[PDB]
Design a binder for this molecule. Structure first.
Ligand SMILES: Cc1ccc(C)c(C(=O)Nc2ccc3cc(-c4ccccc4)nn3c2)n1
Ligand SMILES: [Mg+2]
Ligand SMILES: [Zn+2]
Length: 313
């Protein structure tokens, strides 16, 4: 109970910032996550022994893929920590508990393939879950790990608190299905512009937590340029492997996934910033003003991609 976690001085300072990079020392990522739970939630939210055993089983169940790996899980959880710390009073005890766990678990047992590739391959997971195929798997893996002995980090919650927190974790993980994001933002945009948005409406909170999850999941586009640029290599390594696999099935992949079309990458980033990233962080800055730095960093990176096209790098 009197045991705290402390980071070195640079991490202690930089970790509060949206654009923090968790760095290349894997063995420090668990301490970073625990430190974020303790300041975000309390030193009393979880039994330290259970939380650590939970963190290590979650790590074990992320695969060695180029992008959708353990580092992504912790990066996405750090983005949520920054949003929660900059919006202290807006969220309940349970939501802060549930969302950091949801973020750490959101891509459990990912194989580096889109829902689309699962459907065209006829993967068994696509028979079991017709929509948000991987996202229903990820939630399923989360429940499994929570049911291992010594792993119930929610043991001290009531029956109905426990069910509320698993329902928050489920909606949060489903919402990382980017196919659901477009409608979700459109509805938040309309609700905010006609002043109907109400945070005591549970169906409204759900949508807002959905957008936060999208924003944390895409937070690669909100880092400083050198981090954003190097992360894009990992993202495309998965996309091009998926493209190769599409060709193996006898299907011409979309150009995003075709390694023969590396040349067109910079223009593809423009489209994604214009269609997805900027609208995401814009709508988020409108609903949650203190998240504005994410919008600013995304715009900076769009500007860096335009410079790449213009031969200026
Ligand atoms: C989910 C997520 C999170 C972060 C990023 C950064 C991306 C991401 O990079 N998304 C996208 C979207 C569309 C798109 C088209 C292209 C293209 C490439 C080469 C030739 C032609 C077209 N790349 N590309 C990339 N996606
Ligand atoms: Mg995912
Ligand atoms: Zn993700």
């Amino acid at each position: 109970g009197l045991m705290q976690f402390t980071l070195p001085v640079r991490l202690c300072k930089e970790i509060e910032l949206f654009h923090f990079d968790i760095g290349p020392f894997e063995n420090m990522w668990p301490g970073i996550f625990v430190y974020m739970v303790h300041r975000s939630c309390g030193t009393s939210c979880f039994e330290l022994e259970k939380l650590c055993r939970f963190i290590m089983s979650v790590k074990k169940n992320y695969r060695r893929v180029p992008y959708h790996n353990w580092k992504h899980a912790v990066t996405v959880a750090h983005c949520m920590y920054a949003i929660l710390q900059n919006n202290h009073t807006l969220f309940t005890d349970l939501e802060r508990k549930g969302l950091l766990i949801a973020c750490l678990c959101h891509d459990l047992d990912h194989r580096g393939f889109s829902n689309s590739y699962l459907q065209k391959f006829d993967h068994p997971l696509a028979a079991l879950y017709s929509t948000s195929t991987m996202e229903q798997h990820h939630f399923s893996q989360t429940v499994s790990i929570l049911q291992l002995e010594g792993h119930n980090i929610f043991s001290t919650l009531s029956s109905s608190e426990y069910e509320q927190v698993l329902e928050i974790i489920r909606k949060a993980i489903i919402a990382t299905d980017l196919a659901l994001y477009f409608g979700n933002r459109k509805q938040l945009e309309e609700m905010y512009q006609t002043g109907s948005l109400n945070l005591n409406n549970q169906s409204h909170r759900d949508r807002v937590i959905g957008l936060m999850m999208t924003a944390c999941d895409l937070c690669s586009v909100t880092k400083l340029w050198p981090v954003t640029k190097l992360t894009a290599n990992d993202i495309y390594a998965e996309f091009w492997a998926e493209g190769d696999e599409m060709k193996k099935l006898g299907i011409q992949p979309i150009p995003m996934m075709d390694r023969d079309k590396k040349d067109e990458v910079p223009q593809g980033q423009l489209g994604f910033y214009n269609a997805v990233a900027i609208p995401c962080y814009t709508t988020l800055t409108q609903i949650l003003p203190p998240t504005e730095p994410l919008l600013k960093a995304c715009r900076d990176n769009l500007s860096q991609w335009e410079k790449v096209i213009r031969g200026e790098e």
